[PDB]
Ligand SMILES: Nc1ncnc2c1ncn2[C@@H]1O[C@H](COP(=O)(O)OP(=O)(O)CP(=O)(O)O)[C@@H](O)[C@H]1O
């Protein structure tokens with residue numbers, strides 16, 4: 516997607532200060548980084564700069580959603596400075612702010628090979644452009660203030676590099692507001708985009724897409740677009756029940772149901788048929804008397820229906836077989852969302868078996884792409900991240916792409 520945009524590999528950073536937007540918005544538990552995949556995924560771009568004789572490297576990102584309110588005790592990027600220092604083996608200068616005189620002078624003529632990490636960009640309402648004040652009232656940013664903020668960020672360097680794929684879908688100040696003669700996309704951006712371009716412009720055939728999750732309404736455009744590129748599609752998780760109900764008139768008990776999505780199901784099937792797309796739905800399920808990790812377990816099939824008062828939380832053995840059948844024929848796979856409540860061991864077996872199949876397919880030459888989010892965390896708790904072709908570092912961003920949208924984060928990049 517950047518074949519028409521400027522990239523790091525085509526930039527000259529010798530003796531220059533580099534302002535690099537990155538995505539260090541990692542998850543925490545109480546004071547520790549539960550997952551540092553996002554930090555490690557940006558190192559390749561940081562080193563390339565340093566190894567190429569860079570005067571300095573200024574990194575900026577956000578953490579959570581403070582709403583433009585300084586919350587150092589809740590969303591401080593300080594702990595990320597400690598984590599980075601160890602992964603880089605180099606010293607990192609952390610600043611209590613990301614804009615202002617003090618920061619601006621600190622980033623002017625610094626000691627060569629200097630790594631500087633700025634503070635949460637969202638501690639200012641100028642980043643997103645909106646937020647709230649102490650009074651609790653929702654406020655809007657001033658065009659004059661926005662220009663100032665964007666102007667301060669631009670003074671931090673000579674060239675600008677964007678490697679925040681996970682934030683590529685946001686049209687915030689640090690993503691599209693930096694005013695510098697050169698805006699280059701990082702390696703992480705080049706890598707992530709290269710995989711999704713393969714599964715969006717010219718995939719290997721057969722091409723299979725596995726879509727799970729809970730709701731259907733917020734997935735309509737994702738399915739609609741994918742129905743123009745895939746050969747086979749698996750509809751699993753709570754999503755399936757909305758299709759079985761409208762398509763087979765099957766009873767679903769107290770299982771998840773999407774009223775809004777139920778009205779489009781028939782239009783989705785019609786599009787698949789016209790395009791020659793095979794849609795695999797589950798044939799049996801693992802039920803529960805209630806929504807609880809320690810609920811009573813049962814079983815059911817499409818033909819028998821789900822008993823009243825019960826609900827399907829995972830697929831069954833026969834469904835696992837069909838899924839594997841589709842996985843075996845594929846030459847490329849895109850997976851987004853679990854096919855069952857994987858957070859509870861008793862209902863994660865269906866997702867576990869599919870992962871095993873997906874892992875075996877990769878070792879046979881199949882291109883396997885797992886979209887970030889709930890389906891990304893799985894592989895982590897399974898240590899099967901290096902058992903597939905690619906695990907995305909951006910769920911909401913990769914979703915935007917799959918829907919066929921344009922990420923403001925890359926469009927704002929310099930042309931070539
Ligand atoms: N058969 C099923 N019944 C109920 N929940 C299911 C399910 N199959 C999957 N899920 C749940 O679906 C969730 C993923 O759904 P989805 O991708 O829509 O979530 P989301 O993060 O966009 C917001 P929400 O989960 O609130 O809808 C997982 O947390 C998983 O436990």
Ligand SMILES: [Mg+2]
Nearest residue numbers: 728729730733
């Ligand atoms: Mg959702």
